[PDB]
Design a protein around this ligand. Structure first.
Ligand SMILES: CC(=O)N[C@@H]1[C@@H](O[C@@H]2O[C@H](CO)[C@H](O)[C@H](O)[C@H]2O)[C@H](O)[C@@H](CO)O[C@H]1O
Ligand SMILES: [Ca+2]
Length: 162
């Protein structure tokens, strides 16, 4: 698998007050930086999401989404998550996508900071697509604690069959 060019980043919210965690940090190929949902007041509640345009080249269809948690500490990583994909011809930009359709994939991540890979069905649109990665709930401050209400992602990407 090969990494797919990403562009046109969007997020349901982002924290820039309590720390510097804007949406761009989930796409900069740097495991030491992350996007964080907004938790300073007025805070954002679940679900949280990130969205981007994936451009695998004409003729190709993306194969998977990868997710890398923040790497400094465990602080309630994503648990149940969902992936939406729409053809790029459906809207002018990521921000113009109103209807994401049914999820093409769901996963329950284990309690960890290691890289997660979500395989996508071979029936999704080929070509350039808009992608939304959505965190519906989260792990707790420990593995058996009540789930937290925020989210953080160090790296998000699409891959394609090389
Ligand atoms: C600054 C710090 O270490 N704070 C701790 C909390 O961690 C922060 O949590 C907020 C969300 O509430 C952000 O996620 C931020 O990035 C984290 O550093 C931690 O959740 C609590 C409980 O252990 O202690 C705080 O001290
Ligand atoms: Ca990063």
């Amino acid at each position: 698998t090969k990494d797919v060019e990403a562009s046109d980043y969007a997020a349901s919210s982002q924290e820039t007050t309590g720390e510097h965690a804007p949406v761009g940090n989930a796409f900069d190929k740097n495991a030491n930086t992350f996007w964080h949902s907004k938790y300073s007041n007025p805070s954002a509640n679940l679900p949280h999401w990130l969205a981007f345009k994936a451009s695998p080249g004409e003729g190709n269809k993306i194969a998977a989404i990868t997710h890398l948690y923040r790497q400094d500490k465990l602080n309630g990583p994503a648990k149940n998550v969902a992936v939406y994909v729409v053809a790029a011809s459906d809207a002018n930009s990521v921000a113009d996508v109103t209807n994401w359709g049914e999820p093409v994939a769901t996963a329950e991540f284990p309690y960890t900071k290691e890289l997660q890979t979500i395989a996508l069905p071979n029936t999704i649109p080929s070509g350039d697509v808009y992608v939304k990665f959505q965190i519906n709930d989260a792990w707790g401050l420990t593995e058996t604690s009540a789930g937290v209400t925020w989210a953080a992602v160090a790296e998000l990407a699409a891959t394609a069959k090389a």
